[PDB]
Design an enzyme around this catalytic site. Structure first.
Site, short mmCIF file in Angstrom:
data_model
loop_
_atom_site.label_atom_id
_atom_site.label_comp_id
_atom_site.label_asym_id
_atom_site.label_seq_id
_atom_site.Cartn_x
_atom_site.Cartn_y
_atom_site.Cartn_z
N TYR A 174 2.94 10.28 0.60
CA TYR A 174 3.95 9.61 1.76
C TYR A 174 5.39 9.91 1.39
CZ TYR A 174 -0.25 6.61 2.95
OH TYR A 174 -1.44 6.12 3.16
N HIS A 189 -7.73 9.31 -2.58
CA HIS A 189 -7.15 9.21 -1.30
C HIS A 189 -8.31 9.71 -0.20
CE1 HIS A 189 -3.15 8.98 0.87
NE2 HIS A 189 -4.09 8.92 1.80
N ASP A 246 0.84 -1.31 -0.06
CA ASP A 246 0.01 -0.02 -0.11
C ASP A 246 0.99 1.21 0.07
OD1 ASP A 246 -2.84 1.20 0.31
OD2 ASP A 246 -1.51 2.25 1.79
N1 LIG Z 1 -5.98 5.85 3.16
C1 LIG Z 1 -5.75 6.51 4.10
O1 LIG Z 1 -5.85 7.55 4.45
C2 LIG Z 1 -4.61 5.91 5.12
C3 LIG Z 1 -4.36 6.36 6.35
C4 LIG Z 1 -3.39 5.90 7.38
C5 LIG Z 1 -2.86 4.84 6.98
N2 LIG Z 1 -2.94 4.15 5.58
C6 LIG Z 1 -2.29 3.05 5.24
O2 LIG Z 1 -2.40 1.90 6.33
C7 LIG Z 1 -0.92 1.66 6.79
C8 LIG Z 1 -1.08 1.18 8.08
O3 LIG Z 1 -1.45 2.26 8.96
P1 LIG Z 1 -0.54 3.01 9.99
O4 LIG Z 1 0.80 3.22 9.31
O5 LIG Z 1 -1.14 4.22 10.51
O6 LIG Z 1 -0.24 2.21 11.19
P2 LIG Z 1 -0.17 0.92 11.86
O7 LIG Z 1 0.04 -0.25 10.74
O8 LIG Z 1 -1.67 0.62 12.62
O9 LIG Z 1 0.90 0.85 12.94
C9 LIG Z 1 2.10 1.12 12.33
C10 LIG Z 1 2.90 1.31 13.60
O10 LIG Z 1 3.14 -0.13 14.56
C11 LIG Z 1 4.32 -0.32 14.68
N3 LIG Z 1 4.30 -2.04 14.64
C12 LIG Z 1 4.25 -2.70 13.30
N4 LIG Z 1 4.25 -4.25 13.61
C13 LIG Z 1 4.57 -4.25 15.05
C14 LIG Z 1 4.63 -5.19 15.82
N5 LIG Z 1 4.54 -6.63 15.40
N6 LIG Z 1 4.79 -5.10 17.20
C15 LIG Z 1 4.81 -3.76 17.47
N7 LIG Z 1 4.78 -2.73 16.76
C16 LIG Z 1 4.43 -3.11 15.49
C17 LIG Z 1 5.32 0.09 13.54
O11 LIG Z 1 6.63 0.14 14.14
P3 LIG Z 1 7.92 0.18 12.86
O12 LIG Z 1 7.45 0.50 11.79
O13 LIG Z 1 8.95 1.06 13.67
O14 LIG Z 1 8.23 -1.51 12.93
C18 LIG Z 1 4.72 1.31 13.39
O15 LIG Z 1 5.09 2.31 14.50
C19 LIG Z 1 -0.13 2.84 6.38
O16 LIG Z 1 1.36 2.72 6.40
C20 LIG Z 1 -0.70 3.39 4.98
O17 LIG Z 1 -0.33 2.40 4.14
C21 LIG Z 1 -3.68 4.78 4.83
#
Ligand SMILES: NC(=O)c1ccc[n+]([C@@H]2O[C@H](COP(=O)([O-])OP(=O)(O)OC[C@H]3O[C@@H](n4cnc5c(N)ncnc54)[C@H](OP(=O)(O)O)[C@@H]3O)[C@@H](O)[C@H]2O)c1
Ligand SMILES: O=C(O)COc1cc(F)ccc1C(=O)NCc1cccc(B(O)O)c1
Length: 313
Positions: free
Chosen positions: A49, A111, A44
């Site tokens: 980004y 988006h 994704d």
């Molecule tokens: N469409 C939209 O408007 C929108 C908005 C938000 C997000 N998104 C997409 O959704 C994705 C995921 O959401 P997000 O990035 O907000 O957050 P998330 O996936 O809920 O959380 C990411 C965080 O969790 C940590 N983490 C990952 N695996 C872990 C584990 N096994 N144990 C402990 N901590 C862990 C990561 O640390 P490290 O990386 O340091 O390991 C990072 O700090 C985004 O990256 C993006 O691609 C889209």
């Protein structure tokens, strides 16, 4: 559990992908390489980004290495809000394609439903702190997305952060040519989304859950915010299943027939997070996790709360 879900364009989408928001440009190439090595087949991405070039380096290496074939990958990106005008959509898509090293995307999303004034700035704001909007509407932007399918740039089109009435507006668009394949929305035990999910699923639109771990690295986090990964109730479910809390949080949306896109740049966590096809949450576990809803959002787009198309009123 089967690894892919059938979309309404006839293509299959992997239910577990790698998120890339906040992945540092100096770490995301490795992250994507490791992810592909350990089985991820869906990434994704988004222009906003600012790391698509570095994601693309990884994809291209793994294709060149013949670790994976292009038809086995499912690459998603998103049209940023400052590109909703008809004359800017193709170039925005083509910049993303160039950066990702691809000649098509598997899925391209609007988006957010909110269009902003075009220009260099991703968030053009006025003195009130509110965004300067575009006079585009979701329906003309959708027609521009449909053109991308018909030009071969993208295999599927969809939407993100659209509320129920906005999904319905698209589905009711005069002359609609392609229904959205996906609505990507925030979803986790503190924002369970039963109403919007059932509506989308009932129309054949697949839902992708973002921030499934509660985005602990979100830039606006405050210490008093709730924390999914540290919630004792969720930790207890994980312990019962001999899995990590993150693995429970990833399996949860999978069992609701959602796609889920956890983000990590940590190699060990990238591998751990994929090891979620070897266990099942019970129906009681699922209902218990759903009971934690509190309508809490990581992503509330707070500078746009007066935009005519703001989704979360
Ligand atoms: N469409 C939209 O408007 C929108 C908005 C938000 C997000 N998104 C997409 O959704 C994705 C995921 O959401 P997000 O990035 O907000 O957050 P998330 O996936 O809920 O959380 C990411 C965080 O969790 C940590 N983490 C990952 N695996 C872990 C584990 N096994 N144990 C402990 N901590 C862990 C990561 O640390 P490290 O990386 O340091 O390991 C990072 O700090 C985004 O990256 C993006 O691609 C889209
Ligand atoms: O919208 C997303 O996918 C994740 O949130 C952001 C990511 C960015 F790179 C820039 C801005 C946001 C924002 O909404 N504020």
């Amino acid at each position: 559990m089967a690894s892919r879900i059938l979309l309404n364009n006839g293509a299959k989408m992997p239910i577990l992908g790698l998120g890339t928001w906040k992945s540092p440009p100096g770490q995301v190439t490795e992250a994507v390489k490791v992810a592909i090595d350990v089985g991820y087949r869906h990434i994704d991405c988004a222009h906003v980004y600012q790391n698509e070039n570095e994601v693309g380096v990884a994809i291209q290496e793994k294709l060149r290495e013949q670790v994976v074939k292009r038809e086995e990958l499912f690459i998603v990106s998103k049209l940023w809000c400052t590109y909703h005008e008809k004359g800017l959509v193709k170039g925005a898509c083509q910049k993303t394609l160039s950066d990702l090293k691809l000649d098509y995307l598997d899925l391209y999303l609007i988006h957010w439903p909110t269009g902003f004034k075009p220009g260099k700035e991703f968030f053009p704001l006025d003195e009130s702190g509110n965004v300067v909007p575009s006079d585009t509407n979701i329906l003309d932007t959708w027609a521009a997305m449909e053109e991308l399918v018909d030009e071969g740039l993208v295999k599927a089109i969809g939407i993100s952060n659209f509320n129920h009435l906005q999904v319905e507006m698209i589905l009711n668009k005069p002359g609609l040519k392609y229904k959205p394949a996906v609505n990507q929305i925030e979803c986790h035990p503190y924002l369970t989304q039963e109403k919007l999910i059932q509506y989308c699923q009932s129309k054949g639109i697949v839902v992708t859950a973002y921030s499934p771990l509660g985005s602990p690295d979100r830039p606006w986090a405050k210490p008093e915010d709730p924390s999914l990964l540290e919630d004792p109730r969720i930790k207890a479910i994980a312990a019962k299943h001999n899995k990590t809390t993150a693995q429970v949080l990833i399996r949860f949306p999978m069992q609701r027939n959602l796609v889920v896109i956890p983000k990590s740049v940590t190699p060990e966590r990238i591998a751990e997070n994929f090891k979620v096809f070897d266990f099942e949450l019970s129906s009681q576990d699922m209902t218990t996790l759903l009971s934690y809803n509190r309508n809490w959002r990581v992503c509330a787009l707070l500078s746009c709360t007066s935009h005519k198309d703001y989704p979360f009123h």
